[PDB]
Amino acid sequence: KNANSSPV
Amino acid sequence: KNANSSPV
Amino acid sequence: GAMGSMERASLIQKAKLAEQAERYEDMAAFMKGAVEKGEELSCEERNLLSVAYKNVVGGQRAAWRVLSSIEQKSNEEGSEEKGPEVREYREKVETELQGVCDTVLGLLDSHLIKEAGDAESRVFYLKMKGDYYRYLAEVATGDDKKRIIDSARSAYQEAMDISKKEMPPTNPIRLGLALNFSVFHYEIANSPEEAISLAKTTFDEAMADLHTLSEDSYKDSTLIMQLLRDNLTLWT
Amino acid sequence: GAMGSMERASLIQKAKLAEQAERYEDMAAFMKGAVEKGEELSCEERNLLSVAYKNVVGGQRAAWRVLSSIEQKSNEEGSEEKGPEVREYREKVETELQGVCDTVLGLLDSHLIKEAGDAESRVFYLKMKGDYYRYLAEVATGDDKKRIIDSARSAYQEAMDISKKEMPPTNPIRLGLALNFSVFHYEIANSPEEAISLAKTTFDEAMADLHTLSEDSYKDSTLIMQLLRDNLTLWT
Ligand SMILES: [Ca+2]
Ligand SMILES: [Ca+2]
Ligand SMILES: [Mg+2]
Ligand SMILES: [Mg+2]
Ligand SMILES: [Mg+2]
Ligand SMILES: [Mg+2]
Ligand code: NA
Ligand code: NA
Ligand code: NA
Ligand code: NA
């Protein structure tokens, strides 16, 4: 994955 | 898992 | 629906068991059944719904990325022709991913968003709507790509407007929304400067509000703030 | 079958793509379609078939163990009554696991084992037959439990007899068969001494044959020998 996104 | 088994 | 005969409470109970068993497809089907009972979802139930579908689509997205990479390499100069199988199988995974996104968007439209009056629930669902249009955008190539992107942008923007008016800057859903909207700007909308600006401002406004929080709230907020910082480290 | 219209070679190609994408349910469906073309499987194709179903059932077994543990705790003294949901959902996962095992055993019986004349293919398939009866045995509780256990034992025993006559003690399939039959003795047949004896003798006879092997064969054999040693460390 290219970037961090929200866990929820 | 209780023990090691074969990878194939 | 196949869950129509099961009690709402039993569906929620089984969604929690499926999570413990890492059976996320089951978890999503149980939570879909719960949504289709027609009652609003509690905070914990909204989290179960999101976790379930996040894991299902997350596996699909990872597979799609593997297959798209193979497909791209097959179209490079000097690459041996291997027939239609790579494209076919990428399309298979893509169509299944699109189907899950359509299912989630369908639940949000029937009728979770309409009945969400509190800021926390409305922002949560509008963020979800942005997220699943963003996942659709990751694979879109046709004449609907611009419309998919604008649908994600529109949902995120409405969520941002409510969240800024009604929630503290440290609220974990506000933070996760800003995080995801910033990723949308960087990865989808070809707007890295907007992505970086949003992550920076979001981080700084949360930092200034940490002093108001209990130890446990502090931990929840700093967890998401660290993801904003991680992205800024990737991007700058 | 749903794969009836796809070329055998395309099914094998897509099984390899599914493996790269960690899409093991797809991988298993592709390999089932390939088996159902009616031709024998090459060594590489047998490995793809096994890897695919091993991963599918492995996830099911892990989920079943989580749910069975929760169910067992619910039946302890002082545990609050929570209704039928834990049992129902354990049964759901159990029935799906049994269905996959039945599918694999069906492929072995129609007609992979019958047409396997070479030692390597026949031992591979008989080991698989033992394995999937062993997975059925892990969840069996009724009046067929003894028959399921004996079906696993019978398949493993036939594979052992052929492997001892026709394959070197370092052959990775012979080693993996002995490893799994030893686990069957320890975990299923309540025969820990037999399990330990088999693992020891298998390890020692392989050690004595390593000198005959190339560097790459040596690596393949010692990988499985290490699993025998790991089990002996657990068991002694
Ligand atoms: Ca396909
Ligand atoms: Ca169930
Ligand atoms: Mg009811
Ligand atoms: Mg309402
Ligand atoms: Mg043909
Ligand atoms: Mg033959
Ligand atoms: Na091809
Ligand atoms: Na508020
Ligand atoms: Na209950
Ligand atoms: Na031989």
Beta-carbon count within 10 A of D164 CB: 13
Cα–Cα distance, C120 to C7 (Å, whole number): 26
Beta-carbon count within 10 A of C53 CB: 25
Experimental method: X-ray
Cα–Cα distance, C167 to A6 (Å, whole number): 17
Cα–ligand 10 centroid distance for D168 (angstroms) = 7
Cα–Cα distance, C197 to C180 (Å, whole number): 13
Q: Which chain B residue has its CA at the smallest distance from D61's CA?
A: B1
Beta-carbon count within 10 A of C27 CB: 25
Beta-carbon count within 10 A of D211 CB: 8
Cα–Cα distance, C211 to C191 (Å, whole number): 32
C61 φ, ψ to 5°?
-60, -40
The shortest CB-CB distance from C187 to any of A3, A7, A8 is to A3
Tokens 């699909």 locate to C60
| A7 contacts C183? CB cut-off 8 A | no
Beta-carbon count within 10 A of D49 CB: 27
* Contact residues for D201 (Cβ-Cβ < 8 A; gap 6+): none
Beta-carbon count within 10 A of D192 CB: 14
- For chain C, domain boundaries: 8-235
Query: Taking each helix axis from N to C terminus, what angle separates C192-207 and C215-235, rounded to the nearest 10 degrees?
Result: 150
* Contact residues for C137 (Cβ-Cβ < 8 A; gap 6+): C145, C148, C149, C152, C188
Reading the block at residue C188, the tokens are: 């989808």
Nearest to D198 by CA among D216, D180, D182: D182
Cα–Cα distance, C131 to D149 (Å, whole number): 49
The shortest CB-CB distance from D176 to any of B1, B2, B6 is to B6
Q: Is the Cα torsion angle D8, D134, D144, D90 positive or negative in sign?
A: negative
| D23 contacts C85? CB cut-off 8 A | no
SS3 state at A7: coil
Cα–Cα distance, C183 to D137 (Å, whole number): 48
The one-character DSSP state at A6 is -
The shortest CB-CB distance from B6 to any of D180, D187, D234 is to D180
Reading the block at residue D102, the tokens are: 């039945």
Tokens 């039946």 locate to D75
| A4 contacts C179? CB cut-off 8 A | yes
Tokens 């256990």 locate to D149
CB contact at 8 A, D167 and D174: yes
Reading the block at residue D116, the tokens are: 């396997």
Cα–Cα distance, D42 to D85 (Å, whole number): 45
Cα–ligand 10 centroid distance for C217 (angstroms) = 66
Contacts with C62 from chain A: Cβ below 8 Å: 1
Nearest to D180 by CA among D212, D142, D134: D134
User: Chain C neighbours among D 108-147 (CB < 8 Å)?
Assistant: none
CB contact at 8 A, C90 and C64: yes
Cα–Cα distance, D69 to D75 (Å, whole number): 10
Reading the block at residue D211, the tokens are: 């000198």
| A3 contacts C234? CB cut-off 8 A | yes
Q: In this structure, which amino acid lies at residue C160? A: M
∠ Cα D190 D179 D104 (to 5°): 90
Query: Which 3-state string (H, E, C) describes chain D?
Result: CCCCCCCHHHHHHHHHHHHHCCCHHHHHHHHHHHHCCCCCCCHHHHHHHHHHHHHHHHHHHHHHHHHHHHHHHHCCCCCCCCCCHHHHHHHHHHHHHHHHHHHHHHHHHHHHCCCCCCHHHHHHHHHHHHHHHHHHHHHCCCCCHHHHHHHHHHHHHHHHHHHHHHCCCCCHHHHHHHHHHHHHHHHHCCCHHHHHHHHHHHHHHHHCCHHHCCHHHHHHHHHHHHHHHHHHHHHC
Ligand approaching nearest to the C-alpha of C173: 8
Reading the block at residue C50, the tokens are: 């999101």
The separation between CA D35 and the C-alpha centre of its own chain, rounded to angstroms, equals 17
Cα–Cα distance, C160 to C1 (Å, whole number): 34
Q: In this structure, which amino acid lies at residue D232? A: L
Cα–Cα distance, D42 to D16 (Å, whole number): 14
CA distances C153 to C27, C105, C188, Å, are 28, 15, 10
* Contact residues for C85 (Cβ-Cβ < 8 A; gap 6+): D10, D13, D14, D17
User: Chain D neighbours among C 59-78 (CB < 8 Å)?
Assistant: 59, 62-63, 66-67, 70
∠ Cα D191 C21 C105 (to 5°): 155
Nearest to C149 by CA among C189, C192, C198: C189
CB contact at 8 A, C228 and C183: no
> Under CATH, to which class is C8-235 assigned?
mainly alpha
Query: Which 3-state string (H, E, C) describes chain C?
Result: CCCCCCCHHHHHHHHHHHHHCCCHHHHHHHHHHHHCCCCCCCHHHHHHHHHHHHHHHHHHHHHHHHHHHHHHHHCCCCCCCCCCHHHHHHHHHHHHHHHHHHHHHHHHHHHHCCCCCCHHHHHHHHHHHHHHHHHHHHHCCCCCHHHHHHHHHHHHHHHHHHHHHHCCCCCHHHHHHHHHHHHHHHHHCCCHHHHHHHHHHHHHHHHCCHHHCCHHHHHHHHHHHHHHHHHHHHHC
Q: Does the CB of C95 have a partner CB in chain D at under 8 Å?
A: no
Q: In this structure, which amino acid lies at residue D59? A: G
CB contact at 8 A, D157 and D205: no
| Touching status, chains D and A (3+ beta-carbon pairs under 8 Å) | no
Q: How would you label D122-158 residue by residue, b for 16+ Cβ within 10 Å and e otherwise? A: bbbbbbbbbbbbbbbbbbbeeeeeeebbebbbebbeb
SS3 state at B7: coil
- Asked if the bond preceding C185 is cis, omega within 30° of 0, the reply is no
CB contact at 8 A, A6 and C179: yes
3-class SS shares of chain A: helix, strand, coil, % to 5 = 0, 0, 100
Reading the block at residue C20, the tokens are: 């413990």
CA distances D230 to C51, C93, D169, D226, Å, are 36, 38, 18, 6
